[PDB]
Amino acid sequence: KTSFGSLKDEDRIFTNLYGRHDWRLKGAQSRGDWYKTKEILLKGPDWILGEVKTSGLRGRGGAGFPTGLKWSFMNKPSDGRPKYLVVNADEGEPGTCKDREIIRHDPHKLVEGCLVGGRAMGARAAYIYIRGEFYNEASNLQVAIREAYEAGLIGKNACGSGYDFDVFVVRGAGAYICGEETALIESIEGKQGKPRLKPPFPADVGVFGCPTTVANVETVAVSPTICRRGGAWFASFGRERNSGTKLFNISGHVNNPCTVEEEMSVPLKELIEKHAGGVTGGWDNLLAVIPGGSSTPLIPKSVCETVLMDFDALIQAQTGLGTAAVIVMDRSTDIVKAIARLIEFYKHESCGQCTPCREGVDWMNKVMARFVRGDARPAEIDSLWEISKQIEGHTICALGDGAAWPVQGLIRHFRPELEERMQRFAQQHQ
C-alpha cells in the first residue's frame, strides 16, 4: 500500500468516540468490548506480548517507543515486590484532547485494556493517574470501574480467569509535568511531581519501588482490540514501523475543530481538508501547523502539502509526531505571540528540579516576550538558538526538550519575520 487514510468505520477501534452511544457496560459490550476477555487472559502473557509486538504498536503517549518491547521489560519472575500497571491519563499537552474522549466515552475499553496489559506484564493492579481537571471524566471512569467490578470483569477472579486484578483511579492536582512517567510515579507516591532520573527505569524501580509500566490511555485501550482482531490486522495499517490507527486532535484555525481516528500515515492536508472542514480561509490561508502538540516544532505551509502524519515522516520533516494533535495557524496569526505563549506555558508548567529547565525556560520566555514586541537585536536570535540547544538534552526529562523545540522550529522557519519585527521596533522607537 502507498496511499494511507480514509479509514473505514469497521476498522475504528474507538467507536463511540463522540458520545452518541452508551458509554456504560451494556453499551460497551454491545460494541465489542469485554468479548472473550477470559480467553485472552488464559492464553498467557507471552501471547499478548507477541500480539502487541506483531502489531507494530508504538507508544501513543507521544514518544513512539514500541509497546510490546516496552511491556516485555516487565515479563520477568517476581522478586518479592508486586508489579503494577500505571495508566497515564494526564494529557496536559496543548492541542491534545484525545485521552479525555477515551476515558469519557469508551471507559470500559480503557478498563479492559488495563486488564489485558496488566495480565501481559504480571501486574497486580492498575493505577489510572487521571488528570485532576477531568473530574467528570474521572467519575465517569469510576462508574465504569464499578460496573466492571460488579460484573466480575475485574477484581477477584477477573473475567473468570483466576487472575486477580484491581483498577484504581488516582487524580492529579494541576501539574502538566505529572504526565511525565517518573513525575507521575512520584505524584502517585504523594510527593511533588518531580521526574526521577533514568536509570532506574519504571520496569525496575517504578511506583512505590515496584516494577511498573507507565502507558498512555490510547496505547492501553487499543490492546484488547489488537488481541481480538490480531496483530496482523493492526499492522496492516500505516507504513512499516508506523503501524495502526491514531486519534487526531485538529484544533486552532480550522472550520470544524474535531477529534477523529484516522489511519497512521495519512497526509496532513487530507486530514485537515477531510475531517476538519479545511483551514479557515482555504488552504492558501495556511501559515504553519504545529503537527502533534505543543512540544513538537512547527512546520510551515510548504511542508504541510505533502507530509504524512506518522512518526518517521514528521521526523524527516525535522519535527515530531508527538500526541498527533494538529494545531492549525492561519496567515492572520502573529506566530511569535503564539510561540511565546507556548513558552510561557512551558515555564508555568515546569517543576523547577534541574537547572537547565528551571532557569533557561524562564530565560527563553523573557527573550521570546521581547521578541513579540521586537525589543531585541538580531544577534539575540542566534543567542536564543544556543540557549535552546543548551536546554535540549541536558535536562532530566523531556520538558526541557519540549520547551526548546518550538523555539527552534520558530527560528528555523520564521527568522525573517522575527528580524523584521525587531527592525520595525528599532526604527519606530529610535
Binding site: 492541542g95 481537571e133 475531517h275 494545531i327 505563549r341
Partner: protein, 213 residues
C-alpha cells in the same frame, strides 16, 4: 501568589479545620487504595478532599492531613504549593478558570476573558466583592477542539462566545447551574457540520475476532 506562609488571623495553625465523619470514611477508602507502608501516597487525594470540604486550604488542613497520614507537615506544604488546584487563598464560590494557551488563544479566548472582566468588574486574579466569582487565567485544560472554553469549579463550559459566557455567569448568579458542555450546536468533539466518521452502526461483539481465540 506567595509560596511562603505568614500567620494571619484568618489563616494560622489555630484556625479551626476538621474533617466531617463521612469525610473520615472517604479518607479510609482513599488510604486503602495504597500498599501497607506507603500511606504517604494518599497525600494528594486527602488534601483535595480537605479542599472540597473547606473550599480552600488554611494551614490547618495541611497540618491535619500531615497528622492523619503520619507524614511530616513540610511534605504536605510542598504538595500544596506545587500543584495549582490547591487554593492556599480563599477563592470565590465559582472559581472561573479561563484557558489562554495557544489553541484557545487562536480561537479568541481573549474575547471571553475581556467579557468576563467587563461582566464582573474584576480583572485576572481578583475576586468579586460578594465572593461568588474568582477569575484566574490558566494553562491548557485539555479541551482544545472545544476551544475557546472555561472551567467553573468542576465543569467544562466549551465552544464559547462572549454572549455564552455572560449567559453562564448570569444563570450562576441566579443560583442555578448551567450544563457542562459546548455552547455551539455540537455535543462533545465532533465536527460541527455533521459527522465525517463513525456514521455507520458499530459492529458489535465478535466482529473480526481472529481464529484461535
Amino acid at each position: 501568589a506567595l509560596f511562603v506562609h505568614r500567620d494571619t488571623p484568618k489563616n494560622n495553625p489555630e484556625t479551626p479545620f476538621d474533617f466531617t465523619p463521612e469525610n473520615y470514611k472517604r479518607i479510609e477508602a482513599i488510604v486503602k487504595n495504597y500498599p501497607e507502608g506507603h500511606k504517604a501516597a494518599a497525600v494528594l487525594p486527602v488534601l483535595d478532599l480537605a479542599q472540597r470540604q473547606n473550599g480552600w486550604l488554611p494551614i490547618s488542613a495541611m497540618n491535619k492531613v500531615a497528622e492523619i497520614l503520619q507524614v511530616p507537615p513540610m511534605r504536605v506544604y510542598e504538595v500544596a504549593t506545587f500543584y495549582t488546584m490547591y487554593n492556599r487563598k480563599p477563592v470565590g464560590k465559582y472559581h472561573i478558570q479561563v484557558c489562554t494557551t495557544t489553541p484557545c488563544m487562536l480561537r479568541n479566548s481573549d474575547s471571553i476573558l475581556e467579557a468576563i472582566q467587563k461582566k464582573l468588574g474584576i480583572k485576572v486574579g481578583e475576586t468579586t466583592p460578594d465572593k461568588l466569582f474568582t477569575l484566574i487565567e490558566v494553562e491548557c485544560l485539555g479541551a482544545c477542539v472545544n476551544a475557546p472554553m472555561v472551567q467553573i469549579n468542576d465543569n467544562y463550559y466549551e465552544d464559547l462566545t462572549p454572549k455564552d459566557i455572560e449567559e453562564i455567569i448570569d444563570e450562576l448568579k441566579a443560583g442555578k447551574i448551567p450544563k457542562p458542555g459546548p455552547r455551539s450546536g455540537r455535543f462533545s468533539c465532533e465536527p460541527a457540520g455533521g459527522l465525517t466518521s463513525l456514521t455507520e452502526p458499530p459492529k458489535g461483539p465478535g466482529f473480526g475476532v481472529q481464529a484461535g481465540l
